[PDB]
Amino acid sequence: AKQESTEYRRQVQSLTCEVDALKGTNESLERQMREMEENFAVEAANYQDTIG
Amino acid sequence: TSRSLYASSPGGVYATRSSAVRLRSSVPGVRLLQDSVDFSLADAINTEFKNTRTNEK
Amino acid sequence: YASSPGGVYATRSSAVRLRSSVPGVRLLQDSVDFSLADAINTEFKNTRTNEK
Amino acid sequence: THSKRTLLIKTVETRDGQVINETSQHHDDLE
Amino acid sequence: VDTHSKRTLLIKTVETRDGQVINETSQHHDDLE
Amino acid sequence: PNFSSLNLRETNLDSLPLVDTHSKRTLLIKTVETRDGQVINETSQHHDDLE
Amino acid sequence: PNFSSLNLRETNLDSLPLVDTHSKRTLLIKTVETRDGQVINETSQHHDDLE
Protein backbone atom coordinates (compact mmCIF):
# COMPACT_ATOMS: atom_id res chain seq x y z
CA ALA A 1 0.00 0.00 0.00
CA LYS A 2 3.01 2.38 0.49
CA GLN A 3 4.42 1.33 -2.95
CA GLU A 4 0.88 1.47 -4.50
CA SER A 5 0.36 5.01 -3.05
CA THR A 6 3.18 6.33 -5.34
CA GLU A 7 1.17 5.45 -8.47
CA TYR A 8 -2.23 5.76 -6.68
CA ARG A 9 -1.70 9.52 -5.95
CA ARG A 10 -0.96 10.04 -9.71
CA GLN A 11 -3.86 7.75 -10.82
CA VAL A 12 -6.24 9.68 -8.48
CA GLN A 13 -4.95 13.08 -9.68
CA SER A 14 -4.99 12.06 -13.41
CA LEU A 15 -8.50 10.50 -13.18
CA THR A 16 -9.58 13.64 -11.22
CA CYS A 17 -8.18 15.99 -13.93
CA GLU A 18 -9.49 13.74 -16.79
CA VAL A 19 -12.98 13.83 -15.19
CA ASP A 20 -12.53 17.63 -14.59
CA ALA A 21 -11.38 18.07 -18.25
CA LEU A 22 -14.45 16.04 -19.42
CA LYS A 23 -16.51 18.41 -17.14
CA GLY A 24 -15.02 21.56 -18.71
CA THR A 25 -15.59 19.72 -22.06
CA ASN A 26 -19.29 19.00 -21.25
CA GLU A 27 -20.04 22.66 -20.23
CA SER A 28 -18.20 23.70 -23.46
CA LEU A 29 -20.17 21.09 -25.50
CA GLU A 30 -23.40 22.64 -24.18
CA ARG A 31 -21.82 25.95 -25.45
CA GLN A 32 -21.48 24.23 -28.87
CA MET A 33 -25.20 23.22 -28.48
CA ARG A 34 -26.16 26.87 -27.63
CA GLU A 35 -24.19 28.01 -30.69
CA MET A 36 -26.08 25.26 -32.62
CA GLU A 37 -29.41 26.65 -31.22
CA GLU A 38 -28.42 30.04 -32.70
CA ASN A 39 -27.32 28.28 -35.98
CA PHE A 40 -30.69 26.41 -36.45
CA ALA A 41 -32.47 29.65 -35.48
CA VAL A 42 -30.58 31.96 -37.91
CA GLU A 43 -30.98 29.16 -40.55
CA ALA A 44 -34.77 29.16 -40.03
CA ALA A 45 -35.47 32.89 -39.40
CA ASN A 46 -32.68 34.91 -41.15
CA TYR A 47 -33.19 32.85 -44.35
CA GLN A 48 -36.87 33.96 -44.20
CA ASP A 49 -35.66 37.58 -43.57
CA THR A 50 -33.87 37.16 -46.93
CA ILE A 51 -37.18 35.82 -48.34
CA GLY A 52 -38.78 38.94 -46.68
CA THR B 1 -37.04 18.97 -81.39
CA SER B 2 -37.66 17.32 -77.97
CA ARG B 3 -35.79 14.16 -76.94
CA SER B 4 -34.97 13.45 -73.25
CA LEU B 5 -33.54 10.68 -70.97
CA TYR B 6 -35.26 7.49 -72.27
CA ALA B 7 -32.66 5.33 -70.40
CA SER B 8 -33.73 2.87 -67.64
CA SER B 9 -31.63 2.31 -64.43
CA PRO B 10 -29.76 5.68 -64.00
CA GLY B 11 -26.05 4.97 -63.27
CA GLY B 12 -26.56 1.28 -64.38
CA VAL B 13 -28.32 0.54 -61.05
CA TYR B 14 -29.94 -2.70 -59.91
CA ALA B 15 -30.00 -4.58 -56.54
CA THR B 16 -26.64 -6.46 -56.89
CA ARG B 17 -26.12 -9.33 -54.39
CA SER B 18 -24.46 -8.33 -51.14
CA SER B 19 -23.45 -11.31 -48.93
CA ALA B 20 -21.11 -10.74 -45.97
CA VAL B 21 -19.33 -12.62 -43.15
CA ARG B 22 -21.79 -15.18 -41.59
CA LEU B 23 -22.60 -13.19 -38.39
CA ARG B 24 -24.83 -15.36 -36.12
CA SER B 25 -26.51 -12.57 -34.14
CA SER B 26 -29.82 -13.43 -32.57
CA VAL B 27 -32.26 -10.55 -33.29
CA PRO B 28 -35.50 -10.57 -31.17
CA GLY B 29 -37.28 -8.95 -34.15
CA VAL B 30 -39.36 -6.06 -32.68
CA ARG B 31 -41.42 -5.46 -35.85
CA LEU B 32 -42.32 -2.27 -37.42
CA LEU B 33 -45.53 -3.61 -38.96
CA GLN B 34 -46.16 -1.98 -42.35
CA ASP B 35 -49.84 -1.09 -42.89
CA SER B 36 -48.45 0.44 -46.12
CA VAL B 37 -47.62 -3.02 -47.61
CA ASP B 38 -48.83 -1.33 -50.75
CA PHE B 39 -51.36 1.05 -49.19
CA SER B 40 -51.89 1.17 -53.03
CA LEU B 41 -55.67 1.43 -52.70
CA ALA B 42 -54.56 4.96 -51.57
CA ASP B 43 -52.40 5.40 -54.82
CA ALA B 44 -55.11 4.14 -57.15
CA ILE B 45 -57.05 6.65 -54.96
CA ASN B 46 -54.26 9.26 -55.69
CA THR B 47 -55.19 8.58 -59.35
CA GLU B 48 -58.92 8.94 -58.36
CA PHE B 49 -58.23 12.19 -56.33
CA LYS B 50 -57.35 13.27 -59.92
CA ASN B 51 -60.00 11.32 -61.93
CA THR B 52 -62.40 13.29 -59.66
CA ARG B 53 -60.46 16.36 -60.97
CA THR B 54 -60.70 15.04 -64.58
CA ASN B 55 -64.53 14.62 -64.47
CA GLU B 56 -65.06 18.07 -62.81
CA LYS B 57 -62.72 19.55 -65.51
CA TYR C 1 -35.09 21.81 -77.24
CA ALA C 2 -35.07 20.71 -73.57
CA SER C 3 -32.37 17.95 -73.51
CA SER C 4 -32.10 18.53 -69.71
CA PRO C 5 -31.33 15.40 -67.57
CA GLY C 6 -34.18 15.38 -64.98
CA GLY C 7 -32.79 12.04 -63.61
CA VAL C 8 -30.17 12.54 -60.83
CA TYR C 9 -28.30 9.48 -59.42
CA ALA C 10 -29.70 8.93 -55.88
CA THR C 11 -26.28 7.68 -54.73
CA ARG C 12 -26.35 4.35 -52.83
CA SER C 13 -23.35 2.99 -50.88
CA SER C 14 -22.88 -0.42 -49.20
CA ALA C 15 -19.24 -1.09 -48.31
CA VAL C 16 -18.83 -4.61 -46.79
CA ARG C 17 -20.74 -4.55 -43.51
CA LEU C 18 -18.26 -6.16 -41.07
CA ARG C 19 -18.97 -8.25 -37.89
CA SER C 20 -21.58 -6.00 -36.20
CA SER C 21 -21.27 -8.11 -33.00
CA VAL C 22 -21.12 -4.71 -31.20
CA PRO C 23 -24.67 -4.73 -29.64
CA GLY C 24 -24.89 -0.90 -29.06
CA VAL C 25 -27.45 -0.25 -31.88
CA ARG C 26 -30.33 1.43 -29.99
CA LEU C 27 -33.80 1.23 -31.58
CA LEU C 28 -35.56 4.41 -32.81
CA GLN C 29 -38.61 4.23 -35.19
CA ASP C 30 -39.32 7.90 -35.86
CA SER C 31 -41.80 8.57 -38.76
CA VAL C 32 -43.38 10.05 -40.96
CA ASP C 33 -44.71 13.72 -41.22
CA PHE C 34 -45.09 14.22 -44.32
CA SER C 35 -47.72 16.92 -43.37
CA LEU C 36 -46.68 18.32 -46.80
CA ALA C 37 -48.42 15.22 -48.33
CA ASP C 38 -51.65 16.18 -46.44
CA ALA C 39 -51.13 19.77 -47.61
CA ILE C 40 -50.83 18.28 -51.19
CA ASN C 41 -54.03 16.20 -50.54
CA THR C 42 -55.65 19.52 -49.46
CA GLU C 43 -54.22 21.20 -52.63
CA PHE C 44 -55.83 18.33 -54.66
CA LYS C 45 -59.18 19.09 -52.88
CA ASN C 46 -58.58 22.84 -53.54
CA THR C 47 -57.58 22.22 -57.22
CA ARG C 48 -60.76 20.10 -57.66
CA THR C 49 -62.76 22.84 -55.87
CA ASN C 50 -61.27 25.36 -58.36
CA GLU C 51 -62.07 22.91 -61.24
CA LYS C 52 -65.69 22.90 -59.75
CA THR D 1 -58.24 30.34 -55.46
CA HIS D 2 -58.94 30.12 -52.37
CA SER D 3 -55.14 30.17 -52.64
CA LYS D 4 -52.55 28.37 -50.42
CA ARG D 5 -53.47 29.53 -46.89
CA THR D 6 -51.07 26.89 -45.47
CA LEU D 7 -51.20 27.00 -41.65
CA LEU D 8 -47.89 25.18 -41.01
CA ILE D 9 -47.96 24.24 -37.31
CA LYS D 10 -44.42 22.87 -36.46
CA THR D 11 -45.75 20.69 -33.60
CA VAL D 12 -42.42 19.51 -32.09
CA GLU D 13 -43.60 17.15 -29.33
CA THR D 14 -40.53 17.58 -27.03
CA ARG D 15 -39.94 14.36 -25.29
CA ASP D 16 -36.57 15.09 -26.91
CA GLY D 17 -35.58 15.57 -30.53
CA GLN D 18 -34.13 12.56 -32.39
CA VAL D 19 -37.15 10.72 -30.71
CA ILE D 20 -38.64 12.12 -33.17
CA ASN D 21 -41.78 14.24 -33.62
CA GLU D 22 -41.19 17.01 -36.22
CA THR D 23 -44.98 17.27 -36.97
CA SER D 24 -44.98 20.00 -39.66
CA GLN D 25 -48.81 19.91 -40.01
CA HIS D 26 -49.36 21.64 -43.41
CA HIS D 27 -53.03 22.73 -43.08
CA ASP D 28 -53.21 23.84 -46.74
CA ASP D 29 -56.50 25.77 -46.34
CA LEU D 30 -58.56 27.01 -49.32
CA GLU D 31 -60.11 30.23 -47.80
CA VAL E 1 -55.75 35.27 -53.66
CA ASP E 2 -55.04 34.52 -49.97
CA THR E 3 -52.04 33.00 -48.08
CA HIS E 4 -49.73 33.73 -45.03
CA SER E 5 -51.34 31.65 -42.25
CA LYS E 6 -48.14 31.72 -40.05
CA ARG E 7 -45.59 28.94 -40.65
CA THR E 8 -44.60 28.79 -36.95
CA LEU E 9 -41.25 26.86 -37.21
CA LEU E 10 -40.93 26.23 -33.45
CA ILE E 11 -37.74 24.11 -33.87
CA LYS E 12 -36.94 22.27 -30.57
CA THR E 13 -34.16 19.77 -29.86
CA VAL E 14 -33.16 18.31 -26.56
CA GLU E 15 -31.36 15.59 -26.55
CA THR E 16 -31.40 14.04 -23.12
CA ARG E 17 -28.15 11.98 -23.21
CA ASP E 18 -27.36 8.94 -20.99
CA GLY E 19 -30.27 10.06 -18.64
CA GLN E 20 -28.81 13.63 -18.16
CA VAL E 21 -29.74 16.95 -19.89
CA ILE E 22 -26.66 18.08 -21.91
CA ASN E 23 -28.60 20.91 -23.72
CA GLU E 24 -32.14 22.43 -23.55
CA THR E 25 -33.15 24.20 -26.83
CA SER E 26 -36.54 25.84 -27.50
CA GLN E 27 -36.38 28.02 -30.66
CA HIS E 28 -39.34 30.20 -31.92
CA HIS E 29 -39.38 31.28 -35.62
CA ASP E 30 -42.63 32.39 -37.26
CA ASP E 31 -42.30 32.25 -41.08
CA LEU E 32 -44.99 34.47 -42.68
CA GLU E 33 -46.13 31.60 -45.01
CA PRO F 1 -62.68 17.36 -51.88
CA ASN F 2 -59.91 19.89 -52.20
CA PHE F 3 -57.86 17.06 -50.85
CA SER F 4 -55.71 18.30 -47.96
CA SER F 5 -54.43 19.95 -45.00
CA LEU F 6 -52.37 17.20 -43.27
CA ASN F 7 -51.55 15.98 -39.80
CA LEU F 8 -49.57 12.81 -40.22
CA ARG F 9 -46.89 13.04 -37.49
CA GLU F 10 -45.74 10.99 -34.52
CA THR F 11 -46.38 13.42 -31.57
CA ASN F 12 -46.11 10.67 -28.90
CA LEU F 13 -46.22 7.62 -31.27
CA ASP F 14 -42.55 8.61 -31.66
CA SER F 15 -41.39 8.82 -28.24
CA LEU F 16 -41.88 5.11 -29.31
CA PRO F 17 -41.37 1.95 -27.07
CA LEU F 18 -37.88 3.56 -27.05
CA VAL F 19 -36.89 3.84 -23.34
CA ASP F 20 -34.04 6.43 -23.82
CA THR F 21 -33.09 4.26 -26.08
CA HIS F 22 -31.92 2.43 -22.88
CA SER F 23 -34.09 0.23 -20.55
CA LYS F 24 -32.36 1.84 -17.47
CA ARG F 25 -30.57 -1.55 -17.88
CA THR F 26 -28.71 -1.66 -14.55
CA LEU F 27 -26.66 -4.87 -15.09
CA LEU F 28 -25.36 -5.45 -11.52
CA ILE F 29 -22.86 -8.34 -12.01
CA LYS F 30 -22.58 -9.28 -8.29
CA THR F 31 -19.74 -11.84 -8.59
CA VAL F 32 -19.88 -13.73 -5.25
CA GLU F 33 -16.60 -15.68 -5.23
CA THR F 34 -17.00 -18.32 -2.48
CA ARG F 35 -14.34 -20.89 -1.43
CA ASP F 36 -14.84 -23.78 1.06
CA GLY F 37 -18.42 -22.41 1.67
CA GLN F 38 -17.19 -18.89 2.78
CA VAL F 39 -17.32 -15.62 0.70
CA ILE F 40 -13.71 -14.66 -0.20
CA ASN F 41 -14.60 -11.87 -2.71
CA GLU F 42 -17.82 -9.93 -3.57
CA THR F 43 -17.12 -7.92 -6.77
CA SER F 44 -20.37 -6.01 -7.58
CA GLN F 45 -19.59 -4.64 -11.09
CA HIS F 46 -22.33 -2.23 -12.36
CA HIS F 47 -22.84 -1.77 -16.09
CA ASP F 48 -25.61 0.64 -17.22
CA ASP F 49 -25.36 -0.47 -20.85
CA LEU F 50 -27.74 1.10 -23.40
CA GLU F 51 -30.77 -1.00 -24.59
CA PRO G 1 -66.52 22.74 -51.86
CA ASN G 2 -67.43 21.25 -48.40
CA PHE G 3 -63.77 20.07 -48.11
CA SER G 4 -61.97 19.28 -44.84
CA SER G 5 -63.96 16.02 -45.13
CA LEU G 6 -60.71 15.39 -46.96
CA ASN G 7 -58.54 16.56 -45.06
CA LEU G 8 -55.76 14.23 -46.24
CA ARG G 9 -56.05 12.74 -42.86
CA GLU G 10 -55.68 12.75 -39.69
CA THR G 11 -53.88 9.43 -39.81
CA ASN G 12 -53.48 11.34 -36.97
CA LEU G 13 -51.50 13.91 -34.92
CA ASP G 14 -50.74 10.64 -33.01
CA SER G 15 -50.05 11.53 -29.45
CA LEU G 16 -50.77 7.75 -29.19
CA PRO G 17 -49.94 5.61 -26.06
CA LEU G 18 -47.00 3.84 -27.89
CA VAL G 19 -44.54 4.80 -25.09
CA ASP G 20 -41.80 3.09 -23.02
CA THR G 21 -40.17 6.35 -21.66
CA HIS G 22 -42.84 5.89 -19.79
CA SER G 23 -39.63 4.27 -18.60
CA LYS G 24 -38.94 0.50 -18.52
CA ARG G 25 -37.74 0.62 -14.83
CA THR G 26 -35.79 -2.67 -14.47
CA LEU G 27 -35.94 -3.02 -10.64
CA LEU G 28 -33.67 -6.13 -10.47
CA ILE G 29 -33.84 -7.21 -6.76
CA LYS G 30 -30.99 -9.81 -6.94
CA THR G 31 -31.75 -11.48 -3.56
CA VAL G 32 -28.57 -13.57 -3.05
CA GLU G 33 -29.55 -15.78 -0.10
CA THR G 34 -26.21 -17.17 1.12
CA ARG G 35 -25.76 -19.69 3.93
CA ASP G 36 -22.26 -19.48 5.55
CA GLY G 37 -21.13 -17.66 2.29
CA GLN G 38 -22.40 -20.30 -0.21
CA VAL G 39 -25.27 -19.16 -2.50
CA ILE G 40 -28.39 -21.25 -1.65
CA ASN G 41 -30.87 -19.12 -3.67
CA GLU G 42 -30.65 -16.18 -6.08
CA THR G 43 -34.23 -14.82 -6.12
CA SER G 44 -33.58 -12.23 -8.89
CA GLN G 45 -36.97 -10.43 -8.79
CA HIS G 46 -37.11 -8.50 -12.11
CA HIS G 47 -39.92 -6.02 -11.48
CA ASP G 48 -40.20 -4.93 -15.14
CA ASP G 49 -42.18 -1.75 -14.52
CA LEU G 50 -43.27 0.48 -17.51
CA GLU G 51 -43.89 3.90 -15.79
From Swiss-Prot, chain E:
Localization (cell): Cytoplasm; Cytoplasm, Cytoskeleton; Nucleus matrix; Cell membrane
Modified residue annotations for Phosphothreonine: T3, T13, T25
Modified-residue entries (N6-acetyllysine), positions: K12
Cross-link (Glycyl lysine isopeptide (Lys-Gly) (interchain with G-Cter in SUMO1)): K12
Expressed in which tissues: Highly expressed in fibroblasts, some expression in T- and B-lymphocytes, and little or no expression in Burkitt's lymphoma cell lines. Expressed in many hormone-independent mammary carcinoma cell lines.
Position of the Glycyl lysine isopeptide (Lys-Gly) (interchain with G-Cter in SUMO2) cross-link: K6, K12
N6-succinyllysine PTM sites in chain numbering: K12
Phosphoserine modifications at: S5, S26
Signal sequence bounds: none
Subunit structure: Homomer assembled from elementary dimers. Identified in complexes that contain VIM, EZR, AHNAK, BFSP1, BFSP2, ANK2, PLEC, PRX and spectrin. Interacts with BCAS3. Interacts with LGSN. Interacts with SYNM. Interacts (via rod region) with PLEC (via CH 1 domain). Interacts with PLEC isoform 1C. Interacts with STK33. Interacts with LARP6. Interacts with RAB8B. Interacts with TOR1A; the interaction associates TOR1A with the cytoskeleton. Interacts with TOR1AIP1. Interacts with DIAPH1. Interacts with EPPK1; interaction is dependent of higher-order structure of intermediate filament. (Microbial infection) Interacts with HCV core protein.
Pathological condition linked to this protein in its record: Cataract 30, multiple types: An opacification of the crystalline lens of the eye that frequently results in visual impairment or blindness. Opacities vary in morphology, are often confined to a portion of the lens, and may be static or progressive. In general, the more posteriorly located and dense an opacity, the greater the impact on visual function.
Domain notes: The central alpha-helical coiled-coil IF rod domain mediates elementary homodimerization.
Role played: Vimentins are class-III intermediate filaments found in various non-epithelial cells, especially mesenchymal cells. Vimentin is attached to the nucleus, endoplasmic reticulum, and mitochondria, either laterally or terminally. Plays a role in cell directional movement, orientation, cell sheet organization and Golgi complex polarization at the cell migration front. Protects SCRIB from proteasomal degradation and facilitates its localization to intermediate filaments in a cell contact-mediated manner. Involved with LARP6 in the stabilization of type I collagen mRNAs for CO1A1 and CO1A2.
Protein family per UniProt: Belongs to the intermediate filament family.
Entry protein name: Vimentin
Species this protein is from: Homo sapiens (Human)
